[PDB]
Each structure stands twice: as C-alpha cells, then as structure tokens.
C-alpha cells in the first residue's frame with residue numbers, strides 16, 4: 126500500500142543524494158589539490 | 173630626521189647631523205636583486221664584493237676612508253666613510269671607482285678571486301644560516317617566477333656561471349644617472365657637497381633609462397626543506413603584505429608590533445604584553461619568534477619567523493599564532509593598539525635615528541629613489557597616533573582573514589602539518 130508514496134520519496138531521496146555525491150567529489154578534489162600537485166626534488170646531501 | 177635635496181642632472185640628497193663626528197658619502201641605485209634574472213642572479217652581490225675588494229680597500233685605507241656596500245631587493249648602495257673634513261677625498265674615490273675603474277677592478281685576478289669569495293660566502297649561508305635561508309625561501313615561494321623571488325646574494329648555480337661580461341651588462345643597464353642618488357649623511361652641509369660634484373663634470377653613462385619587466389605577484393604556496401640532522405625547526409609564514417607607499421603601510425607595521433618578537437631565554441622578553449605568550453610558554457612551543465611587515469616597491473609580506481626545539485608541538489605553535497592573528501580582524505583591544513603605537517615609534521626611532529651615518533645613507537637614498545624624499549619621524553608618529561582599532565580590523569579583514577599564505581621551513585619540520593591545515597586557521601567558525 127505504500128508503493129505510490131514510496132516511489133515519490135525515492136525520487137526526492139535519489140536527487141538529493143546524487144547531488145550530494147557529485148558535490149562531495151568536487152569538494153574533495155579541492156581539499157586535496159595541494160597534495161595532488163605537490164612537487165619533490167632530491168639533491169644528494171654532501172657527506 | 174631632516175632632509176635637503178637638489179638636482180642638476182645628478183640628484184643629490186643630504187641630511188646634516190652636527191653631532192656626527194664622521195660623514196658618509198656615496199651612491200645608491202634604484203635596482204637590486206629584484207632587477208636581476210634567474211640566470212644572472214647574484215650579479216649585484218658580485219658588484220658589492222669587487223667594490224669592497226682587497227685592492228680597492230687598500231687604496232681607500234691609505235686615504236683614511238672606509239667602504240660599505242648593501243645589496244637589497246629594490247636598491248643597491250656603495251658608500252664611503254671618512255672624517256667630517258676628508259669628505260672632499262671620499263667623492264674623489266667614488267668618482268675614481270665608478271667613473272674610471274671600469275676595467276681596474278674587473279681584472280682576471282681580482283674577479284676570479286672575488287667570485288671565488290662570494291661563492292664560498294653564499295655556500296656558507298645556505299649551509300648554516302637557517303633562519304635567513306628560510307626567510308629567503310619564503311620570498312622565493314611567495315613571489316615565485318616574479319622579480320621579488322630572487323635571493324639577494326644569488327644562487328650558487330648562477331653565481332658560478334658569471335663572467336666579467338655579466339657584471340658589465342648589469343652596470344650598463346643599472347648604474348645610470350637616472351637610476352641613482354648621490355647621498356651624503358653625517359655632519360657635512362648640503363650646499364657644500366654639491367659644489368665638489370660640480371667641481372668635476374663629464375656624463376659617462378647618462379641619458380639612458382633602466383629596463384622594465386613584469387610586476388611582483390604573491391602566490392599562496394610553500395617550500396619545505398626538511399633536514400632531520402638539524403637540532404631545530406625553523407619556519408617563516410606570511411600573507412601578502414603592503415608595498416612602500418601603501419595607505420596601510422603604518423597600520424600593517426603596527427599590527428606586526430602587536431605580536432612582536434620574543435626570545436624565550438631572556439627574562440624580560442617573557443614578560444611582554446602579548447597575549448600569544450600565555451599560550452606558548454606553558455609547554456614552551458619555541459625558542460623565539462618575530463613578526464614582520466616587509467615592504468618593497470611592488471608588494472610586501474606580513475607574517476612571522478620562529479625557531480623551535482619542541483618538534484612535537486609545532487602544530488600548537490602555528491595554531492596559537494594564527495589564532496591570535498584572527499583576533500586582529502574580530503577582537504583586537506584598544507590597549508593592544510596603544511601598546512603597539514608606543515613600541516612602533518620606539519622601533520622607528522632606533523632605525524631612523526641611530527648614531528650611524530652609513531645606515532642613514534642607505535635609508536636616505538632608497539627612500540628618495542621612490543618617494544622623492546625621506547619621511548620625517550614627526551609625520552610618521554602623527555600617522556601612527558591616528559591609527560584606530562577599526563583601522564587595524566579593516567586592514568586585517570583584507571590581508572589576513574581567510575587569505576592565502578606562503579610557508580617555508582627547514583630542519584625537523586615533520587610536525588609542521590600540511591598547507592590546508594595551516595591555511596584553515598586563517599579564519600574561525602561563526603554563526
């Protein structure tokens with residue numbers, strides 16, 4: 126009997142979560158940008 | 173601090189001091205390390221050293237003259253010191269060294285030896301002067317790929333690639349009349365130094381204007397030089413500050429004065445009225461620190477440098493310092509601003525009015541080369557006394573609150589967290 130109401134809430138839930146998911150990826154990439162592009166250089170120390 | 177300036181092609185500026193006992197005369201050029209390239213970097217430090225060459229110094233010593241040369245980011249100086257009366261002979265040495273010794277000082281024997289000297293000199297600095305080496309890397313990462321990033325002494329790589337030709341090309345483009353100011357400080361009078369300059373003549377290397385390029389730009393970044401063999405962690409951190417002639421030049425300096433300097437080993441230093449001290453002395457987060465408001469022609473750097481042996485609590489040192497900085501935007505108190513006013517004056521006083529003529533020469537030249545005349549303390553003190561709590565907050569709200577930072581550090585910096593963690597602390601959470 127909850128069918129109709131179940132699907133209506135499903136549409137709401139899936140649009141919010143899909144958005145939340147894409148949003149979280151963008152946000153994650155931003156907070157990791159400094160580490161992802163971090164550069165290293167080695168200069169053998171003098172003994 | 174009182175100025176006097178006239179011109180006749182060659183711009184002359186002096187500042188008499190009846191209680192001097194000596195006098196300094198010299199030339200200052202409006203070009204420093206920020207006017208070099210990443211490949212001829214160090215050419216100025218090179219000039220400084222041949223001017224102070226052993227040979228050249230003997231020729232001055234016999235004359236009762238002492239030589240001095242300072243290479244900075246925006247300016248460059250060559251000053252001669254003598255007794256108050258021997259001033260006539262100092263100008264002769266200056267004229268001789270920069271309008272005749274175009275190949276005397278650049279001999280294969282003198283050059284290769286000097287080059288060899290500044291090379292070991294710089295190798296030592298890079299090897300042992302951790303606090304200054306770090307501060308130099310701060311400028312290097314903050315203004316990367318921009319004029320202001322080049323180290324004043326230059327890099328060992330470009331230093332050892334330099335030849336007499338490099339020295340000459342720099343001189344031909346920067347040691348020009350339009351990019352210089354003859355300076356005289358000490359007890360000598362203005363309307364007397366100009367005469368000895370008019371006594372001679374010529375115009376060798378004149379009419380030409382110095383070269384131009386891209387302007388300095390601050391970039392939020394960091395350079396980490398970890399070295400676990402060192403006994404300390406030396407770090408320097410800063411936001412983009414103020415350039416000379418900025419409306420907030422004094423406000424920024426007052427802000428730095430609020431957090432000041434500190435030496436954990438000096439009893440009186442531990443007693444200063446700086447709230448930050450209550451947070452860092454419990455667990456002794458550092459051996460010392462010092463705030464600064466560095467100002468140059470194109471941009472500035474506002475921040476601090478610290479040295480610490482508490483390698484496991486570096487996150488607290490940084491956290492507490494940046495948390496105090498947030499206060500400048502939201503809660504700095506009246507008394508904190510008033511204590512800063514008093515001490516800024518005191519520091520400006522010790523800077524602009526030391527008994528030293530060579531210090532005043534550099535300050536006079538470098539300043540007239542930008543604004544046209546050195547600023548009097550009386551006027552500086554008036555601008556300082558007018559700074560309100562609101563001025564500080566408005567300023568902090570733009571240069572500090574949630575703004576990009578530049579970091580550099582060497583030694584045992586494992587405890588120095590990532591960029592973002594540091595960058596986050598530039599603001600606070602609120603409703």
Ligand SMILES: CCCCCCCCCCCO[C@@H]1O[C@H](CO)[C@@H](O[C@H]2O[C@H](CO)[C@@H](O)[C@H](O)[C@H]2O)[C@H](O)[C@H]1O
Nearest residue numbers: 498501572573574575595596597598599600601602603
């Ligand atoms: C368990 C599930 C419950 C989830 C509830 C969701 C919670 C949402 C909280 C949202 C915002 O909370 C808010 O975050 C921003 C940072 O993003 C804070 O901003 C703070 O840092 C930002 C920088 O990133 C600064 O620009 C800003 O001036 C500063 O106040 C703000 O002061 C805070 O109020």
